């Protein structure tokens, strides 16, 4: 009601005039009145603008367009009330904040509140000719602006105008920040390093993601340094970003070695890729026979001497030798895996149809720039005992000496059996054990070797 003409529960503050919004001609005075015995201030607020006035009556003599907005009366008891003031200007139907930014999946408010609400259709429209995309929603408000609903990444760098019944707006360029909808994609330049005390350790973690906000870090795993990374980053467009953080150690020392992990994280989720590094101070090699180093073969059969082994640096010399003489003729060689981390090899020596003669000791040799290493396979072959030598050192004692495999046992016969006078025999031959037995012959009246394989004989004769 109009206020008495005075000639001359705790309540919220009263305002005059008692209206919600008030249209006011440009250049005309804005006269607002607040009645509250415990009044404090009137706050005015268009867009980000803010202003205070500690006088119960707000008076602006020559209203401008900018003067359009929310007028809130507030009392000491914490309580308030507001009224909105539209200052219609035939010229300016929009005061604006061109700065438009939205976040994918959240709403956005275009800031073009109008200074005149006596208009018929508050809608959203085109840009430089063209109209709008479909699926796009907007719930407009004369007091706030127009709120584009549930922005899509697709709307990036879009341009648009404020619609109402038609009105000329000003130029806006939409900018959509993206939502993380996928863990970061992280990679390393090389998953593994075999190093030599003294050289330079280097690596580049590569992280690709949709926003400069991705969190990435290197992690010397048992944690001492955070020893600086050398960052650098690119932006391949709008939602494509990649950053490289190269890790380096000028002088690689044994102690260094461990797993360096590249961690990446974003509000969606996290991802890590690991690279292990081992630094050695001596070129090395160690072998691995794949069968007993001792081997037995039957007369006509075959064998494969196999052996794997670990070498770093890569080998540059390797052979098989039988009698102080190497091969060219019956052996294989090959990397175990053809990765980049392969330090491991394998060689086979294919002995075939080997006659009882091929018995002996076989050696495999291999070396790199720093070390040489080798191991020996003792190959015993089964063969018929050969009578090395028949002797007659005389107490009349007759001797007989043979070799073969397995060890050859010597039985004697007169013409029953004699006894023995001997025993073992330590060198070459290799892969053949030698037997030595003797008899006395001092008993009158007118030499057999054998083992699990064969039996040979030599013969003596004498007379009483």
Ligand X SMILES: *[C@@H]1O[C@H](CO)[C@@H](O)[C@H](O)[C@H]1NC(C)=O
- Among residues 14, 35, 55, 106, the one that binds ligand X under rule CB under 6 A: 106
CB of 378 to ligand X, least distance (A): 10
Smaller CB distance to ligand X: residue 262 or 449? 262
Smaller CB distance to ligand X: residue 19 or 336? 336
213 binds ligand X (CB under 6 A): no
- In angstroms, the CA 374 to CA 357 distance is 24
Are 273 and 281 spatial neighbours (Cβ–Cβ below 8 Å)? no
Q: Which of residues 291-350 bind ligand X (CB under 6 A)?
A: 292, 294, 337, 339, 341-342
Are 352 and 266 spatial neighbours (Cβ–Cβ below 8 Å)? no
CB of 295 to ligand X, least distance (A): 9
Smaller CB distance to ligand X: residue 89 or 229? 229
Smaller CB distance to ligand X: residue 272 or 409? 272
Q: Which of residues 156-185 bind ligand X (CB under 6 A)?
A: 179
Smaller CB distance to ligand X: residue 186 or 447? 186
- Among residues 101, 215, 234, 462, the one that binds ligand X under rule CB under 6 A: 215
105 binds ligand X (CB under 6 A): yes
CB of 292 to ligand X, least distance (A): 4
221 binds ligand X (CB under 6 A): no
Q: Which of residues 380-439 bind ligand X (CB under 6 A)?
A: none
CB of 215 to ligand X, least distance (A): 5
End-to-end Cα distance, the chain: 167
Smaller CB distance to ligand X: residue 16 or 153? 153
CB of 297 to ligand X, least distance (A): 13
Tokens of 300: 């006509």
Smaller CB distance to ligand X: residue 59 or 290? 290
Chain-centroid distance, C-alpha 156: 32
Tell me, by CB under 6 A, how many residues bind ligand X. Answer: 16
Smaller CB distance to ligand X: residue 215 or 462? 215
Burial status of residue 225 (CB atoms within 10 A of its CB: 0-12, 13-18, 19 or more): exposed
**Part in contact with ligand X (CB under 6 A); list of ranges 44-52, 100-108, 318-326, 404-412:** 100-108
Tell me the residue nearest to ligand X as measured from the CB.
339
Smaller CB distance to ligand X: residue 214 or 279? 214
- In angstroms, the CA 60 to CA 320 distance is 106
Task: Find tokens 């906000």 and name the residue.
Answer: 213
CB of 327 to ligand X, least distance (A): 25
CB of 347 to ligand X, least distance (A): 17
Task: List the x/- string, 259-278, binding to ligand X by CB under 6 A.
Answer: ------x-x--x-x------
**List of residues contacting ligand X (CB under 6 A):** 103-106, 179, 215, 265, 267, 270, 272, 292, 294, 337, 339, 341-342
């Amino acid at each position: 009601l109009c206020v008495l003409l005075l000639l001359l529960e705790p309540s919220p503050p009263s305002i005059h005039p008692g209206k919600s919004d008030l249209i006011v001609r440009v250049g005309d005075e804005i006269r607002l009145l607040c009645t509250d015995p415990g009044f404090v201030k009137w706050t005015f607020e268009i867009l980000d603008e803010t202003n205070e006035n500690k006088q119960n009556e707000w008076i602006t003599e020559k209203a401008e367009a900018t003067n359009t907005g929310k007028y809130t009366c507030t009392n000491k008891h914490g309580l308030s009330n507001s009224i909105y003031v539209f200052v219609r200007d035939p010229a300016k139907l929009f005061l604006v904040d061109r700065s438009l930014y939205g976040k994918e999946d959240n709403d956005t408010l275009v800031r073009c509140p109008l200074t005149d609400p006596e208009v018929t259709n508050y809608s959203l429209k085109g840009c430089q000719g063209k109209p709008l995309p479909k699926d796009l929603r907007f719930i407009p408000d004369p007091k706030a602006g127009i709120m584009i609903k549930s922005v899509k990444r697709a709307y990036h760098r879009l341009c648009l105008h404020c619609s109402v019944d038609s009105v000329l707006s000003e130029k806006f360029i939409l900018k959509v920040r993206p939502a993380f909808k996928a863990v970061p994609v992280v990679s390393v330049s090389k998953a593994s390093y075999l190093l030599r005390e003294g050289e330079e350790f280097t690596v580049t973690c590569t992280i690709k993601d949709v926003s400069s906000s991705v969190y990435s870090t290197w992690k010397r795993e048992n944690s001492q340094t955070k020893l600086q990374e050398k960052y650098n980053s690119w932006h391949h467009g709008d939602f494509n970003y990649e950053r490289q953080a190269t890790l380096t150690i000028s002088s690689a020392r044994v102690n260094d070695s461990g797993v360096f992990m590249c961690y990446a994280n974003n509000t969606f989720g996290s991802a890590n890729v690991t690279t292990t590094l081992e630094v050695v101070d001596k070129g090395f090699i160690n072998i691995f026979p794949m069968i007993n180093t001792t081997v037995f073969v039957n007369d006509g059969e075959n064998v494969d001497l196999i052996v794997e082994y670990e070498a770093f640096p890569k080998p540059e010399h390797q052979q098989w030798i039988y009698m102080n003489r190497t091969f060219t003729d019956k052996w294989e060689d090959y990397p175990k895996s053809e990765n980049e981390s392969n330090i491991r090899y394998v060689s086979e020596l294919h002995l075939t149809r080997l006659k009882g003669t091929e018995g002996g000791t076989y050696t495999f040799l291999v070396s790199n720039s720093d070390v040489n290493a080798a191991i020996a396979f003792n190959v015993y072959v089964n063969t018929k005992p050969e009578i090395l030598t028949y002797d007659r050192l005389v107490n009349g004692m007759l001797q007989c000496v043979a070799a073969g495999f397995p060890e050859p046992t010597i039985d004697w016969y007169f013409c029953v059996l004699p006894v023995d006078v001997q025993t073992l025999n330590s060198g070459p031959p290799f892969g053949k054990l030698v037997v030595q037995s003797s008899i006395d012959s001092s008993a009158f009246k007118h030499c057999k070797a054998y083992n699990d394989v064969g039996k040979t004989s030599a013969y003596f004769n004498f007379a009483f």
